C-alpha cells in the first residue's frame, strides 16, 4: 500500500510537471506569437 501510494504520488508529480510544461509552452507560444503577429502586421502594412 505504501508502494502504491508512492506510485500515485509519482503519477501526480508527473501530471503536475506535464501541466507546468503545458503552461510554459503556452507562455512561450504567446511570447513567440507576439513578435510573429508584429512581423505579420509589418508585412501586411507594406502590402497595404
Amino acid at each position: 500500500q505504501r508502494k502504491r501510494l508512492a506510485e500515485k504520488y509519482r503519477e501526480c508529480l508527473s501530471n503536475k510537471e506535464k501541466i507546468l510544461k503545458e503552461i510554459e509552452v503556452k507562455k512561450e507560444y504567446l511570447s513567440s506569437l507576439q513578435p510573429r503577429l508584429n512581423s505579420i502586421m509589418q508585412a501586411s502594412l507594406p502590402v497595404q
Partner: peptide, 28 residues
C-alpha cells in the same frame, strides 16, 4: 458611388487593422 463606397470601406478596414496593429505594438 457604390464602387467608391466599397473602396472607402476597404480603406477604413485597412485603417482599423493598422490601428489594431498599433495598439498591439503599444500593449506588448
Amino acid at each position: 458611388e457604390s464602387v467608391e463606397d466599397k473602396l472607402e470601406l476597404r480603406r477604413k478596414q485597412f485603417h482599423v487593422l493598422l490601428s489594431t496593429i498599433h495598439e498591439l505594438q503599444q500593449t506588448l
